[PDB]
């Protein structure tokens, strides 16, 4: 390996990977035919929350599920922030109690 870690997906993988475990991605279609949208679902042996996200793109809502899923685990005190990357990206607030 030569690389960095600049990202919430490395993250996830990184964390999982030395838990020999590994998260499963699920995209959805959902919404309306003007507007369409894509919901992913993440999901770990061992835990019943799963990472939710959404997000009109699939790579996006791929980001946001795990990203869910991390606060989870910090809350289980099953992660510490200390590993958790710093909040750069601002997105848009469009989401009443969504994410």
Same mark, same amino acid.
């Given at each position: 390996?030569?690389?960095?870690?600049?990202?919430?997906?490395?993250?996830?993988?990184?964390?999982?990977?030395?838990?020999?475990?590994?998260? #499963?991605?699920?995209?959805? *279609?959902?919404?309306?035919? %003007?507007?369409?949208?894509?919901?992913? &679902? !993440?999901?770990? /042996?061992?835990?019943?929350?799963?990472?939710?996200?959404?997000?009109?793109?699939?790579?996006? #809502?791929?980001?946001?599920? *795990?990203?869910?899923?991390? %606060?989870?685990?910090?809350?289980?005190? &099953? !992660?510490?922030? /200390?590993?958790?990357?710093?909040?750069?990206?601002?997105?848009?607030?469009?989401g009443?109690?969504s994410?």
């Amino acid at each position: 390996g030569s690389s960095g870690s600049s990202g919430i997906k490395n993250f996830l993988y990184a964390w999982c990977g030395k838990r020999k475990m590994t998260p #499963a991605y699920e995209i959805r *279609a959902v919404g309306n035919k %003007n507007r369409q949208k894509f919901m992913c &679902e !993440v999901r770990v /042996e061992g835990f019943n929350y799963a990472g939710m996200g959404n997000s009109t793109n699939k790579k996006d #809502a791929q980001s946001n599920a *795990a990203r869910d899923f991390v %606060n989870y685990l910090v809350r289980i005190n &099953e !992660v510490k922030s /200390e590993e958790v990357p710093a909040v750069g990206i601002v997105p848009p607030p469009s989401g009443p109690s969504s994410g």
